[PDB]
Scaffold this active site. Structure first.
Site, PDB file in Angstrom:
ATOM      1  CG  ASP A   1      -0.099  -3.861   2.792  1.00 43.51           C
ATOM      2  OD1 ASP A   1       0.397  -3.447   1.719  1.00 43.51           O
ATOM      3  OD2 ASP A   1      -0.427  -3.107   3.734  1.00 43.51           O
TER       4      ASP A   1
ATOM      5  CG  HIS B   1      -0.438   0.445   2.466  1.00 43.24           C
ATOM      6  ND1 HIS B   1      -0.102  -0.465   3.447  1.00 43.24           N
ATOM      7  CD2 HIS B   1      -0.111   1.668   2.955  1.00 43.24           C
ATOM      8  CE1 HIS B   1       0.413   0.182   4.480  1.00 43.24           C
ATOM      9  NE2 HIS B   1       0.418   1.477   4.207  1.00 43.24           N
TER      10      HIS B   1
ATOM     11  CB  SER C   1       1.984   2.002   6.885  1.00 38.40           C
ATOM     12  OG  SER C   1       1.816   3.009   5.923  1.00 38.40           O
TER      13      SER C   1
HETATM   14  N1  FSN Z   1      -2.784   2.682  13.510  1.00 39.49           N
HETATM   15  C1  FSN Z   1      -2.108   1.873  12.654  1.00 39.49           C
HETATM   16  N2  FSN Z   1      -1.492   0.806  13.222  1.00 39.49           N
HETATM   17  C2  FSN Z   1      -2.063   2.140  11.226  1.00 39.49           C
HETATM   18  C3  FSN Z   1      -1.230   1.392  10.386  1.00 39.49           C
HETATM   19  C4  FSN Z   1      -1.201   1.679   9.017  1.00 39.49           C
HETATM   20  C5  FSN Z   1      -2.015   2.726   8.518  1.00 39.49           C
HETATM   21  C6  FSN Z   1      -2.060   3.024   7.050  1.00 39.49           C
HETATM   22  C7  FSN Z   1      -2.882   2.136   6.135  1.00 39.49           C
HETATM   23  C8  FSN Z   1      -4.306   2.007   6.516  1.00 39.49           C
HETATM   24  O1  FSN Z   1      -4.766   1.731   7.610  1.00 39.49           O
HETATM   25  N3  FSN Z   1      -5.126   2.309   5.406  1.00 39.49           N
HETATM   26  C9  FSN Z   1      -6.582   2.349   5.530  1.00 39.49           C
HETATM   27  C10 FSN Z   1      -7.162   0.989   5.251  1.00 39.49           C
HETATM   28  C11 FSN Z   1      -7.520   0.164   6.334  1.00 39.49           C
HETATM   29  C12 FSN Z   1      -8.089  -1.083   6.081  1.00 39.49           C
HETATM   30  C13 FSN Z   1      -8.278  -1.469   4.747  1.00 39.49           C
HETATM   31  F1  FSN Z   1      -8.850  -2.673   4.571  1.00 39.49           F
HETATM   32  C14 FSN Z   1      -7.927  -0.692   3.634  1.00 39.49           C
HETATM   33  C15 FSN Z   1      -7.349   0.573   3.910  1.00 39.49           C
HETATM   34  C16 FSN Z   1      -4.337   2.783   4.318  1.00 39.49           C
HETATM   35  O2  FSN Z   1      -4.773   3.108   3.225  1.00 39.49           O
HETATM   36  C17 FSN Z   1      -2.937   2.822   4.733  1.00 39.49           C
HETATM   37  C18 FSN Z   1      -2.407   4.194   5.146  1.00 39.49           C
HETATM   38  C19 FSN Z   1      -1.316   4.881   4.430  1.00 39.49           C
HETATM   39  C20 FSN Z   1      -1.072   6.032   5.416  1.00 39.49           C
HETATM   40  C21 FSN Z   1      -1.232   5.344   6.811  1.00 39.49           C
HETATM   41  N4  FSN Z   1      -2.421   4.456   6.660  1.00 39.49           N
HETATM   42  C22 FSN Z   1      -2.845   3.464   9.357  1.00 39.49           C
HETATM   43  C23 FSN Z   1      -2.885   3.183  10.716  1.00 39.49           C
END
Ligand code: FSN
Ligand code: CA
Ligand code: NA
EC number: 3.4.21.5
Lengths: 5, 250, 27
Positions: free
Chosen positions: B99, B43, B198
């Site tokens: 991912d 992603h 991420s």
């Molecule tokens: N709190 C966390 N541990 C955490 C970890 C990763 C992310 C990521 C991805 C992330 O969570 N998402 C949203 C998402 C969540 C579930 C799905 F099935 C599809 C999409 C993203 O698009 C990514 C994104 C890119 C910027 C940060 N964010 C956000 C929060």
């Protein structure tokens, strides 16, 4: 961000 | 990283910063697995819902860093990408299943006190360490809060969570290629990855051979460090056959 | 052959500030 080379 | 702390110098020598060339910004975390290969989340490179589709020339890999914004002269190494490989079955439409992505560098990076590869787990490593309650470590230069940015690399240790608890915390479909980690509301302690982290590594130190292994990749979450929510991670061992296939072929 | 052994820690037998928290959780 500081500029890179 | 929310509710973490400043990393020590050389604490995570496999830490890689994915840096966008223009505009100049932090794109994601990543990790060094050999002198020529870097591992990250798919992603970070491909996510159509947000019109994200980076090509090799769009970014740089910065290795050996500590400060987030400074150009760490005589310490960090900047590398260009030769090719990006995204898992062919990466599910960006639904739940980010599989991912994972690899990036091959144009030239090998020299190892140093601040640059060194992390190990990837084998079947025994995974069976031994991927247990509920066992703690791993996540690192990154991402947001300090869900709603600023750190001066230096942040670190936080988090326990792996029982699969039923992970499943019951979200409406998203969880797969065997994911695991979740974080403290529960009743545990008192806190911490999570957040925007900017991420693609970064979730590592564990084997108590059998004292080596660090990357067991997960920061994949997704709902918000950051919210009570009752957990961070989700790509299960590196489950996708190791793909990793080996790519490295063996290219 | 040297993966996962940090130059500034494992290589010189020094431990970081929180690695013991991980070890204590590997019951
Ligand atoms: N709190 C966390 N541990 C955490 C970890 C990763 C992310 C990521 C991805 C992330 O969570 N998402 C949203 C998402 C969540 C579930 C799905 F099935 C599809 C999409 C993203 O698009 C990514 C994104 C890119 C910027 C940060 N964010 C956000 C929060
Ligand atoms: Ca559910
Ligand atoms: Na939480």
């Amino acid at each position: 961000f500081e500029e890179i080379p | 990283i929310v509710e973490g702390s400043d990393a020590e110098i050389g604490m995570s020598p496999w830490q890689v910063m994915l840096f966008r060339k223009s505009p100049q910004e932090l794109l994601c975390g990543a990790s060094l697995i050999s002198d020529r290969w870097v591992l990250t989340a798919a992603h970070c490179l491909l996510y159509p819902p947000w019109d994200k589709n980076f090509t090799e020339n769009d970014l740089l890999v910065r290795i050996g860093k500590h400060s987030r914004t400074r150009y760490e002269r005589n310490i960090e190494k900047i590398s260009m990408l030769e090719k990006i490989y995204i898992h062919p079955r990466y599910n960006w439409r639904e739940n980010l299943d599989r991912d994972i992505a690899l990036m091959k560098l144009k030239k090998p990076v020299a190892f140093s006190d601040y640059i060194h590869p992390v190990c990837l787990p084998d079947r025994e490593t995974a069976a031994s360490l991927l247990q509920a309650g066992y703690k791993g470590r996540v690192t990154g230069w991402g947001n300090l809060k869900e709603t600023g940015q750190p001066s230096v690399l942040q670190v936080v240790n988090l326990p792996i969570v029982e699969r039923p608890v992970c499943k019951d915390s979200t409406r998203i479909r969880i797969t065997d290629n994911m695991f979740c980690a974080g403290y529960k509301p009743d545990e008192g302690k806190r911490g999570d990855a957040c925007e900017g982290d991420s693609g970064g590594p979730f590592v564990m130190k084997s108590p059998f051979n004292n080596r660090w292994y990357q067991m997960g990749i920061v994949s997704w979450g709902e918000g950051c460090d919210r009570d009752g929510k957990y961070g989700f991670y790509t299960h590196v061992f489950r996708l190791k056959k793909w990793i080996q296939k790519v490295i063996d072929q290219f | 052959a040297d993966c996962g052994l940090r130059p500034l820690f494992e290589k010189k037998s020094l431990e970081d500030k929180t690695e013991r928290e991980l070890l204590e959780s590997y019951i």
